[PDB]
Amino acid sequence: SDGKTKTPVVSTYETFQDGGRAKTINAIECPTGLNNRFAAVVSSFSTAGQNANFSSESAKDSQGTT
Amino acid sequence: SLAQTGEIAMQRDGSVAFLEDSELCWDTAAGSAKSCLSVRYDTVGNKTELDLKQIDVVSAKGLSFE
Amino acid sequence: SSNAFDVIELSSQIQRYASLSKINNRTNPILKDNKAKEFKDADLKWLKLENCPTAGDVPTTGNNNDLQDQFIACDADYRKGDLSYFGSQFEFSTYVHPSNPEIQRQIKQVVSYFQYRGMERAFIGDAAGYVISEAKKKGFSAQDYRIVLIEPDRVGYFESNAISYEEFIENPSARENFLLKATKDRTLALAVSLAQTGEIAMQRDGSVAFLEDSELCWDTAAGSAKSCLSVRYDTVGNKTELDLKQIDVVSAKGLSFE
């Protein structure tokens, strides 16, 4: 694509684990001569902070701000 | 009514077709393992598959699909 | 009264064996090594079926209700007559098989030797005339046809001195030159090589594989370089690559990747 070699972009739906701890995602195996790329984009969010469970793609549980 | 056998030489006009489930292979530098491919038909689903999974990577320039 | 016939029969059966990758739907045992040269013994145990009273080297289907392809009868012995079967020298090249890790080589050349135990060494020329006549009778071109003196080598033997069949018959100067060096450390023998050197056509059963680093091309009005493709290997990456970068656009319908 425009002189640069690319792999097809692959997508995952991610939420943070309870505890406000950072999220670990394993990097895809890149073919020899390519480097890993990553992008995160917002789907659903609220201001509930820790009082929420967004791990379901079909509904969002939001219990409000502390 | 003629039929062709495995011994038939492949012609540059392509009039001779591969036998069903036969694999087009390369002698490759992999040592003892060729990198083959075939066009398979799946009776359940009625769909033709161009199987390249014996080759690790397929490297194209431009690429389009449907 | 069958020595001239038997030399060509065994040689052609040895040549047939040399051209087969699988025998009775099982891997050819001579392709299951990695050595560049191997000598197969004159006893022809390596050419007899495994399902024989004394086990040979040729594999069977396992179920003996099918007709088992064989090359020589089980009691066959060609260490007879003026031209006595002496063994065969195989020369190999390293080879890449898609489905048998024990297959590491393919056959480059086979030369089968027949030592002359005739009354006079000079008479090997006549014995040569009958075999060559029987070979040409059955449609076989004898490649580099020669009377030879062979000595043991690291693997099998090597030809100390060799003379063309034409020179043994038409040049008495050259003939006695050759018969002279035939001493006790050498064995006087006939060297029988068959044919098939030219390049190979791709077959509709796909049994024939492309050669390494070869390119499959299309006539295009684009000229050159933009119509070909190949399967390349990366010696460090240990990955096979299907190189389509010579094609500008690849247009498929359905598409899946991993």
Author numbering:
A (entry chain B): 292 to 357
B (entry chain C): 226 to 291
C (entry chain A): 34 to 291
Which lines from the publication concern this structure?
The toxin-coregulated pilus (TCP), an operon-encoded type IVb pilus (T4bP), plays a crucial role in this process, which requires an additional secreted protein, TcpF, encoded on the same TCP operon; however, its mechanisms of secretion and function remain elusive. The structural analyses reveal how TCP recognizes TcpF and its secretory mechanism via TcpB-dependent pilus elongation and retraction.
To clarify the interaction between TcpB and TcpF, we performed cocrystallization experiments with the TcpB-TcpF complex. The initial phases were solved to a resolution of 4.05 Å by molecular replacement (MR) using the reported TcpF structure and TcpB structure determined here (details below) as search models. In addition, three TcpF molecules were found above the C-terminal domain 3 of TcpB. This feature differed from that of the ETEC CofB-CofJ complex, in which minor pilin CofB interacts with the secreted protein CofJ at a 3:1 molar ratio. Every TcpF molecule was a bilobed structure constituting an NTD and a CTD connected by a short linker, with little interaction between them. These CTDs were spatially separated without direct contact. The structural analysis suggested the existence of a TcpF trimer shaped like a flower with three petals and an N-terminal flexible extension, which partly interacts with the clefts at the interfaces of the TcpB trimer.
